[PDB]
Design a protein around this ligand. Structure first.
Ligand SMILES: [Co+2]
Ligand SMILES: [Co+2]
Ligand SMILES: [Co+2]
Ligand SMILES: [Co+2]
Lengths: 331, 331
């Protein structure tokens, strides 16, 4: 139907280029490793145990491959512990394909001081544009590993001025390279605003995925976002009751409504899971356990797809969301 | 007069313990390297050139030694590019003694997400206390290099709840180890509040230095802070008109007033200079040049001490501020 249009480069994963056809079933928004900004200051008591992280992550990678998932899109922002080299180790040890991102997190929780300062002194937009373009076309930190997607993120009440610098820089790189863009929306807001802003800057709706859209349970919100021609992702499936998130039952209710309205070609599914935390491992209070019980990457494969099928969603619809959509969006 | 009282360990520099007598003239608040939170996300275009940073920093270290400065207290927070190993290279290559810090920056510009999350889930104060204590008594990041001071920092309108976690943790480590505490005050505020809070938590006023006190030009503000028995530092001398800073002429006016009022034993002098920036080097707009012209570490030695002497300050007073005070506070 609506095919990417303009410049384009084959999907770049951490181990190199992959043809769209080789992407297979894909989880479009996950984190192999992740650290909240500040975690590096807790290095003495919260060091990265490389052997342990590698063992644990390759184990999860093998479990995903067992479910037929061939690709994961790692959406970790540059300021949240992003590590392309580690991702490459995990991919070379298991065969699982992994795309990594280029971008900064939203103003509310990102490491914003640096670029705010940069912007106080000059054209921060162009500096961000140069970073993004170099990371997508040449490589990250001199490793030769390129980013396969641009990550953008906005706050709840507005796409702030700080956030807009990244959106503008991304639109420029998108027009020039065709690279896909995936986003974070905070607490179920700004989905429509992100779609309008990006398309208004000349970014291709067929290479845009508005994320955390499962954060809103009013389908009018999703239909309005979809009116822009962009794809939307219910990418925190399994995270129930944390950071304003709804329950999976509520997500599936909205999802089946949209599927029944013919939107399968614009819907994607992920967990936004963290396979290994940076800093000191999080101690989950007893009472927060059910919120995170199904928040792991085998949840959609084992619980959601079956539940969708038993509700009347077809094998074609599941294949469209999990294989066809990723192939066109990232390939 | 007022001598440290309680537990105590000899001054720990990045190359080991130094006797108070060996500290000599000291700059109590500087940064060999520094990065605003987020700089690590700009690694591709703003990588750390180790050979270049080392050459430049050793050159500055040799220039300080030429002026008779034997010690520098590096106050870089854990979340602002702190690097004890690099500091050790600089100290071993030149003989300049360098103490490093343990602590996080203030809420306004620090990398606050990590510990805010940590605190949402449990006793973040005790986790911060453990980090600080380990870094002071055992070492940082498994390097064996220990911190010789605790760095605290507060916002302009209040010592926020997030900041208070660090102040409480520091007071505990201070009572247990005797380690000195140095602080950042934002825009000339909270000096008295920091002194009251720390002493009220049982921290030793003789091991406390309230920083950026040159940020306020009303001497009543300084006298009130000093009433707590703590030392205060005019530690941004040379930075004129940036981040709310006054001119050096205004600083010297307040300083000579306090010196004439007999406060020499509680006054310290530094620049808060950055010898090498992390991330992309800052492009200083033409118009901001005079604000930073004298903001380098040879400024006090070459311009300020002579200016103090020609105004009637005695060689004894200069020696008290630059040698005697550091020796008792850090030694
Ligand atoms: Co997100
Ligand atoms: Co995420
Ligand atoms: Co400061
Ligand atoms: Co400083």
């Amino acid at each position: 139907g609506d095919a990417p249009g303009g410049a384009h480069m084959t999907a770049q994963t951490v181990t190199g280029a992959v043809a769209a056809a080789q992407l297979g079933a894909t989880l479009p928004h996950e984190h192999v490793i992740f650290g909240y900004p500040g975690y590096a200051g807790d290095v003495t008591l919260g060091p990265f145990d490389h052997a342990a992280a590698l063992a644990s992550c390759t184990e999860t990678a093998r479990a995903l491959l067992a479910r037929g998932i061939q690709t994961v899109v790692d959406a970790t922002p540059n300021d949240c512990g992003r590590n392309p080299a580690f991702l490459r180790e995990v991919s070379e040890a298991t065969g699982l394909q992994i795309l990594c991102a280029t971008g900064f997190w939203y103003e509310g929780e990102g490491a914003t001081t640096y670029f705010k300062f940069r912007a106080s002194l000059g054209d921060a937009e162009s500096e961000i544009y140069e970073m993004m373009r170099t990371e997508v076309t040449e490589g990250i930190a001199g490793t030769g590993i390129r980013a396969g997607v641009i990550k953008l993120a906005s706050s709840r009440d507005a796409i702030t001025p700080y956030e807009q610098l990244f959106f503008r820089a991304a639109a420029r790189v998108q027009r020039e390279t065709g690279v896909p863009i995936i986003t974070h929306t905070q607490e179920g807001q700004q989905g429509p605003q992100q779609a309008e802003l990006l398309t208004s800057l000349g970014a291709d709706p067929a290479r845009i995925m508005i994320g955390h859209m499962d954060g809103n349970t009013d389908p009018a919100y999703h239909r309005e976002t979809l009116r822009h021609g962009v794809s939307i992702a219910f990418d925190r499936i399994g995270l129930q009751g944390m950071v304003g998130t709804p329950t999976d039952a509520e997500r599936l209710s909205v999802l089946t409504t949209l599927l029944g309205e013919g939107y399968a070609d614009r819907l994607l599914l992920s967990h936004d899971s963290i396979w290994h935390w940076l800093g000191r491992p999080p101690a989950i209070p007893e009472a927060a356990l059910p919120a995170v019980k199904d928040w792991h990457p085998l949840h959609i494969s084992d619980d959601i797809l079956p539940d969708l099928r038993r509700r009347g969603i077809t094998e074609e619809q599941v294949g469209q969301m999990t294989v066809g959509n990723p192939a066109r969006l990232f390939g």
